[PDB]
Design an enzyme around this catalytic site. Structure first.
Site, mmCIF file in Angstrom:
data_model
loop_
_atom_site.group_PDB
_atom_site.id
_atom_site.type_symbol
_atom_site.label_atom_id
_atom_site.label_comp_id
_atom_site.label_asym_id
_atom_site.label_seq_id
_atom_site.Cartn_x
_atom_site.Cartn_y
_atom_site.Cartn_z
ATOM 1 N N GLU A 153 -5.112 -8.402 -0.172
ATOM 2 C CA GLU A 153 -5.923 -8.164 1.016
ATOM 3 C C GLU A 153 -7.305 -7.737 0.567
ATOM 4 O OE1 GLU A 153 -4.362 -5.280 3.819
ATOM 5 O OE2 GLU A 153 -2.370 -6.217 3.844
ATOM 6 N N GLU A 176 0.822 -1.226 0.000
ATOM 7 C CA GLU A 176 0.000 0.000 0.000
ATOM 8 C C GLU A 176 0.856 1.278 0.000
ATOM 9 O OE1 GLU A 176 -2.903 -0.299 3.240
ATOM 10 O OE2 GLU A 176 -3.449 -2.342 2.652
#
Ligand SMILES: *[C@@H]1O[C@H](CO)[C@@H](O[C@@H]2O[C@H](CO)[C@@H](O)[C@H](O)[C@H]2NC(C)=O)[C@H](O)[C@H]1NC(C)=O
Ligand SMILES: [Ca+2]
Ligand SMILES: [Hg+2]
Length: 444
Positions: free
Chosen positions: A385, A295
């Site tokens: 995720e 991320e």
């Protein structure tokens, strides 16, 4: 077979409308008219064997000047379709439509009205070309099981989706609810970060990975890298949140611009500390879907706080230190940013991934296609995720060919608002979703 199917307006449910034959160029018996009141519509009754995605086209005559129409799928939201002219009968693209197995409705409701509708043609959406996946990993010296894992993943890509979970205890809870176990288990090297070890953190991430590897599973490893320095250690911003930009003054750009400093020395201390844990997994014959600097593009973690260029440079530091210096050959490098400015390069990224947190259990179609464009179909795409496990029916319909999915832990997998046990059972017991059982002997 699976091809264009025209549905004549005359042969449909007419609400406050009538059939006419005056205008020239129509198909079938005639066309439908009488679009005065707002409640006036054409309800087409279409059915499908499975849940597919079809392209919509409307055959219209705009003889009373350019008008606008409302299109309704299964009594859902409207969709305005613009009719530009018209002297004769022509057709407009009315986007895509998802039909569910069984009965469905496509209403053409009066918006502006004063138009003639001949028919509607539903064509199944274009089947995606075979994926041009790279046959070999970037590291030429890749060990047996990494080479095996990559080949097995390559063989299943586009055909099925590998189920996955964050943390081994959550993988056991899934078996307790569905009777099935995630094929893939993801572990976090977080409590191995010296910055955290110094404050008393212990980790069983290597123990959990080897356990699941012995159960015949696939292992994914991420790292919530706690900055070596700059820790505010405030009541609001504790040392244990040290992976967050918000919790450290640690400037990675400054640190990389000054390679002979102390900041850069501690940075390599951290990489080497984590390299001890990966070598421990390598010696145990565990292939790892290594996902560092996750991320990044978000900027909420210190490694993406100084923008794309320092992030990419750090990825290459990790790649040189772990692959060249430490000589780790069990690692399969998984990038976790969608943006091109953030993309490090094809020579250090094996598989592309994304972290998608949206309720509904959808196929996350948009993110998948963005990465299809990023790796130009040469690299596999994974949902590293997810908050909500994707439904296999929708994954297939939207051709969202994610290699694997890994529902996050606490307040997600065990949260009925994100994943119900019902949906979990539906997903885990699908012939599209590979569980621990179904992947057995992949290493043979
Ligand atoms: C080594 O890293 C630390 C943490 O980022 C740096 O220390 C901070 O430096 C800024 C100014 O650049 C100060 O505002 C902070 O108060 C410092 N924090 C602490 C805890 O000392 C340090 O400057 C870095 N070294 C170099 C050469 O940049
Ligand atoms: Ca007709
Ligand atoms: Hg524990």
């Amino acid at each position: 077979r699976d091809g264009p199917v025209t549905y004549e307006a005359e042969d449909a449910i007419l609400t406050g409308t009538t059939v006419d034959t005056a205008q020239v160029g129509y198909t079938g018996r005639g066309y439908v008219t009488g679009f005065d009141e707002g409640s006036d519509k054409i309800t087409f009754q279409i059915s499908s064997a499975t849940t597919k995605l079809y392209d919509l086209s409307i055959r219209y005559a705009a003889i009373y000047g350019d008008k606008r129409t409302n299109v309704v799928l299964n009594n859902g939201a409207v969709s305005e379709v613009f009719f530009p002219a018209g002297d004769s009968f022509t057709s407009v693209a009315a986007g895509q439509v998802l039909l569910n197995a069984g009965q469905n409705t496509i209403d053409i409701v009066n918006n502006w009205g004063w138009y003639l509708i001949d028919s509607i043609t539903l064509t199944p959406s274009a089947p995606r070309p075979p994926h041009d996946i790279n046959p070999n990993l970037n590291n030429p010296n890749a060990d047996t099981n990494a080479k095996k894992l990559y080949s097995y993943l390559r063989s299943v890509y586009g055909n099925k989706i590998i189920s996955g979970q964050q943390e081994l205890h959550h993988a056991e809870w899934i078996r307790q609810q569905t009777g099935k176990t995630p094929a893939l288990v993801a572990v976090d090297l977080m409590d191995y970060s010296p910055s955290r070890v110094e404050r008393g953190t212990t980790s069983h991430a290597v123990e959990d990975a080897i356990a699941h590897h012995n159960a015949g599973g696939i292992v994914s490893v991420l790292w919530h890298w706690n900055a070596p320095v700059g820790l505010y250690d405030t009541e609001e911003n504790k040392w244990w949140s040290g992976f967050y930009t918000r919790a450290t003054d640690f400037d990675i750009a400054a640190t990389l611009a000054n390679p002979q400093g102390a900041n850069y020395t501690l940075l390599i201390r951290d990489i080497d500390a984590i390299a001890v844990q990966l070598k421990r997994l390598e010696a145990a014959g565990v292939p790892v879907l290594w996902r560092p600097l996750h991320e990044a593009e978000g900027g909420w973690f210190w490694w993406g706080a100084k923008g794309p260029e320092p992030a990419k440079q750090l990825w290459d530091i990790l790649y040189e230190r772990l692959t060249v210096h430490h000589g780790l050959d069990n690692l399969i490098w998984v990038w976790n940013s969608i943006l091109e400015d953030w993309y490090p390069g094809d020579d250090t990224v094996d598989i592309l991934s994304a972290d998608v947190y949206a309720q509904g259990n959808g196929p996350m179609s948009t993110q998948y296609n963005e990465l299809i464009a990023l790796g130009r179909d040469k690299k596999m795409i994974a949902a590293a995720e997810v908050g909500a496990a994707p439904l296999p029916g929708l994954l297939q319909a939207y051709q969202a060919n994610w290699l694997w999915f890994a529902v996050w832990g606490d307040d997600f997998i065990n949260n009925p608002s994100w994943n119900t046990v019902a949906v979990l059972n539906e997903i885990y017991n699908s012939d599209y979703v590979l569980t621990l059982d179904e992947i057995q002997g992949w290493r043979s």
